[PDB]
Design a protein around this ligand. Structure first.
Ligand SMILES: [Cl-]
Ligand SMILES: [Cl-]
Ligand SMILES: [Cl-]
Lengths: 389, 376
């Protein structure tokens, strides 16, 4: 028998220390990484459950393993809630990640060497979008699949183009999934043949992937087999349960309010950067372009980190520097807003970031500025705790 | 702020019901599915941690995101412990699953159109090492795939002869290898993969191991990321770290032999009762002689709270890793197999089947109560 009191702290203190350190880090650092969030304790509760013990290859009611009667309920809930949230006729909640969701779509709908028009295969690219040009490329190259993703993207126009040349329409709903769930951005599901997203970024759920589709029996069967046995074996049933409860949380009225906060916070930050003379490329994420100031993204993210502001360097369009250096920062506010930072605080935060960037060439002034900003960041982190009682 | 008291039971009673039902089922059903196990509360603690909130593309000390200084400790522990457990010079603990581990190896080592010798242009082969060598020389595989006791050194020799990579999927014997009960392929193969949740008894996920070879290590690094995956599941990687520490305890080797002892005991019981066995921790009960289908056996046994898979051989696939993990001993395993034979005989004889199912159910319930999976 496993004693239920077995724990990491007593057994594996070095590992435990890294965990408690990370917990503390999530409190006392402001996180501006666009692809991160903070998920609810209920999601973590499901991920920490005994459902990890169940092998469940196949789909609810159609498993290759016995004993799946109760995990079928959890998975069905996740599927039904995903369909409800996105007005889909089909949802596949087994993908382990966005990478596996996307791979499965490719395997479902394309054969290697097929042509693919987008933003093993013959790739054609397109670069506000010029739909006239996308259509011209579609007609010229006859893609098997057209991919669109995330201004306001016109899904109905992509459907029109796909229809014209008999292509599948694949939408990667990355970075607008939460806005779509909240009714704040046009839904690609009615227009695409298939839609993917991760479940941990703007949806704020567990780490994993999700496939959605409007009704098409043949495409749905291809998607089924592509996920399993195509890309995966057994799904992570504890993470699927976590997906079920996260999708329930995402349907709450509070979630649309949170999504608007995400947007308002980004707008406040943008207005501060612009007011301080920093160029923005822009939405819940934006780039701070650092060309005018001769600052590298690497240089800026290091300095901001020392001030307990975690951001990622990022190449600007046509960046003259390598991707390991870059001339920009990428900022997103999903995590900022999730921990309750408001638009005014976001505005001030960006101003603190500008104080750092302005001082970055002056060693003494930069040290002085980082010291000051740290104190301000600590006070904000304490005022807006991520988890607690 | 998330209030830390937020819970599933208060908020999502229907999901909670499915979870508490599954927990109870794990107690009151004997699980004989070969590829399942029961992982420790420490693994589950890690999987339920806040490490799920961290994006950490790249590898420790070489991330594409900031803020990874602490999760780097957890992943380095996982890597170091995998290396020490399997005597490898290289360990990649990021694969989300066995499938992802295997897919990364193909991408790292093979090109589209390459030839592959296993058991892409595919050529398939006691093992007949002569024929293996024959086929290798004949078709010049870019990669040979392998996985009683397999002679790893012979595969290395053959692979060397033709200048092929050697890839071992160790998933069926990983626990035995960790326990020193089966020859370790790691010194011989160029790359080894395994799951972490089957005979290793850890979190659900994948693992890649390799002997020192800087060129191959670089290819594997980039095959896993960005080749097959994006961000790793850092909460699950932490769970791998504590699982690998548990796998190094002397208790673990005792457990691995108990798995084998339990299988041997069940097999003797079936044979003694006239049921044909096809055959380490897995075996097949062939039901053709009695004219029992997998479906009706599976159904009857399931009603007696014995969870099996049906299986080509017609009948049951049985494995004992979970059985041994919850403390069922060999004598108990022998009796369990005899109870299963009572049910099977009742089907074939069409006699007292319902009563016999109930009888085995109450015996199974007592065994489950005597050998709880989790408790205080
Ligand atoms: Cl302990
Ligand atoms: Cl609650
Ligand atoms: Cl395993």
């Amino acid at each position: 028998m496993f004693n239920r009191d077995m724990n990491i702290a007593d057994y594996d203190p070095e590992l435990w220390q890294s965990i408690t350190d990370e917990v503390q880090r999530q409190e006392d650092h402001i996180e501006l990484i666009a692809s991160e969030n903070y998920t609810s304790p209920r999601v973590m509760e499901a991920q920490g459950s005994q459902l990890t013990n169940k092998y469940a290859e196949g789909y609810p009611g159609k498993r290759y393993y016995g004993g799946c009667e109760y995990v079928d309920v959890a998975e069905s809930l996740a599927i039904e809630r995903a369909k409800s949230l996105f007005g889909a006729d089909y949802a596949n909640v087994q993908p382990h990640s966005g990478s596996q969701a996307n791979a499965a779509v490719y395997q479902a709908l394309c054969a290697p060497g097929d042509t693919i028009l987008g933003m093993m295969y013959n790739a054609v690219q397109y670069g506000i979008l010029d739909y006239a040009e996308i259509e011209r490329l579609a007609v010229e190259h006859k893609p098997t699949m057209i991919i669109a993703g995330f201004g306001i993207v016109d899904w109905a126009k992509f459907r029109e183009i796909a229809d014209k040349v008999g292509a599948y329409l694949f939408v990667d709903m990355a970075h607008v999934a939460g806005l779509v769930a909240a009714g704040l951005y046009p839904n690609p599901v009615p227009f695409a043949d298939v839609v993917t997203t991760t479940t941990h970024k703007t949806l704020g759920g567990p780490r994993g992937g999700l496939i959605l589709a409007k009704a098409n029996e043949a495409i749905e069967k291809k998607l089924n087999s592509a996920v399993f046995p195509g890309q995966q074996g057994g799904p992570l049933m504890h993470v699927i349960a976590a997906k079920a409860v996260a999708f329930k949380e995402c349907a709450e009225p509070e979630f649309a309010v949170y999504q608007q906060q995400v947007l308002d916070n980004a707008k406040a930050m943008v207005k501060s950067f612009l007011a301080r003379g920093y160029k923005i490329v822009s939405n819940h994420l934006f780039l701070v372009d650092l060309i005018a100031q001769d600052i590298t993204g690497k240089e800026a993210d290091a300095a901001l980190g020392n001030a307990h502001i975690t951001v990622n360097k990022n190449s600007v369009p046509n960046d003259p520097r390598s991707p390991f250096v870059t001339s920009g920062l990428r900022i997103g506010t999903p995590a900022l807003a999730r921990r309750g930072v408001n638009a005014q605080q976001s505005a001030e935060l960006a101003l603190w970031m500008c104080d750092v960037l302005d001082a970055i060439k002056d060693e003494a002034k930069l040290a002085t500025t980082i010291t000051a900003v740290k104190v301000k960041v600590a006070a904000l982190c304490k005022a807006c705790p991520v988890y607690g009682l």
